[PDB]
């Protein structure tokens, strides 16, 4: 069975864990419980193929940038998550992208830009801003709500499809 | 103040510790989201094989050490075994309850579902 190594990155509090747990457990984690390191495995049928998704849920902040290097080296595709109600988190996306590109030495790494918390009415990142940034990286942009599950499947399915587009799986 | 904890099926979590927490306390949420129950799991301490621990041990005494959680010995809670299926009788999806012309079915537990309902199938095969 084909295994996919996915990594969820982004600033603290954007909903990386809530997105992953919505995929893994089909439940919305209402509390705030900051992640140090959490990996998950789940089987998912995507385009008629049973896929083993190995998902690494990461910390929003690391004391040393070098602590991310190892899981960026082993990860095959990256969900780069910001929250649409958190302008700083959108501004922080580029640091994750430049670190992943540096560690992989490639401008063609499978990635999806995820704008989460689309249920909240206090939006401050416009969908055109998000599309502009995703276009500048050549990656898809997907709006999600981990609270309602809108777009959660789309984000992970699209990342798997981007991995396949990049390498034989 | 942390402990890295290796979990069944090649998973892991790092849990935060503050004085006044048992092993059951620190790991309850990590097992829950993964479809695992402390009832079917044992917790050990990594040595450099492993050493069995009681689920109510003071987590502060284990800080900086590495732990492992396993299914009950020879009672490994298995993972689903999905197969593509064309349903000849009237079938409905166990997730969305809508009509199921064709889909997938776990050969072990019998869960049947649409492809685009598959992320909602529980992780563990019962
Ligand atoms: N309204 C709403 N709240 C959300 C959504 N996703 C996450 N949250 C909330 O935002 C908070 C942080 O979410 P969480 O998943 O912990 O974020 P994180 O990015 O994993 N944080 P960290 O990096 O520290 O691990 C929680 O209170 C959670 O309930 C969403 O889509 N909508
Ligand atoms: Cl790769
Ligand atoms: Cl907008
Ligand atoms: Cl979706
Ligand atoms: Cl049938
Ligand atoms: Cl069932
Ligand atoms: Mg988190
Ligand atoms: Zn060790
Ligand atoms: Zn099954
Ligand atoms: Zn269905």
Author numbering:
A (entry chain A): 1 to 169
B (entry chain B): 56 to 103, 108 to 185
Mind quoting what the paper says about this structure?
The interaction of membrane-bound active RAS with RAF is the first step in the activation of this pathway. Active RAS recruits RAF to the membrane where RAF dimerizes and becomes active. The N-terminal CR1 region contains the RAS-binding domain (RBD) and the cysteine-rich domain (CRD), the CR2 region contains a 14-3-3 recognition site, whereas the C-terminal CR3 region includes the kinase domain and a second binding site for 14-3-3 proteins. Here, we present crystal structures of wild-type and oncogenic mutants of KRAS in complex with the RBD and CRD of RAF1.
We crystallized the GTPase domain of KRAS (residues 1–169) in complex with RAF1(RBDCRD) (residues 52–188) and solved the structures in two different crystal forms, I and II, at a resolution of 1.95 Å and 2.50 Å, respectively. Despite having different crystal packing interactions, the structures of both crystal forms are very similar, with r.m.s. deviation of 0.40 Å for Cα atoms or 0.45 Å for all atoms. Since crystal form I was solved at a higher resolution, subsequent analyses are based on form I unless stated otherwise. The overall structure shows that the two tandem domains of the RAF1 CR1 region, RBD and CRD, directly contact one another to form one structural entity, and RBD as well as CRD interact with KRAS to a similar extent. Similar to what has been observed in the HRAS-RAF1(RBD) and Rap1-RAF1(RBD) structures, the KRAS-RBD interaction interface is mainly formed by the switch-I region, where RBD and KRAS interact mainly via β-strands and form an extended β-sheet structure. Interestingly, the CRD interaction with KRAS does not involve the switch regions. Instead, the KRAS-CRD interface is formed by KRAS residues present in the interswitch region and the C-terminal helix α5. In the KRAS-RBDCRD structure, RBD and CRD are connected by a short linker (residue 132–137), which brings these two domains together with interdomain contacts, resulting in an extended structure. Calculation of the solvent-accessible area shows that 658 Å2 of RBD and 555 Å2 of CRD are buried when RBDCRD is in complex with KRAS, suggesting that both RBD and CRD have similarly sized interaction interfaces with KRAS. Similar to the solution structure, our crystal structure contains two zinc finger motifs—one near the N- and C-terminal ends of CRD formed by residues H139, C165, C168, and C184, and a second one near the β3 strand and 310-helix formed by residues C152, C155, H173, and C176. The structures of the KRAS-RBDCRD complex provide atomic details of the KRAS-CRD interaction interface, which is similar in size to the KRAS-RBD interface and also consists of nine hydrogen bonds.
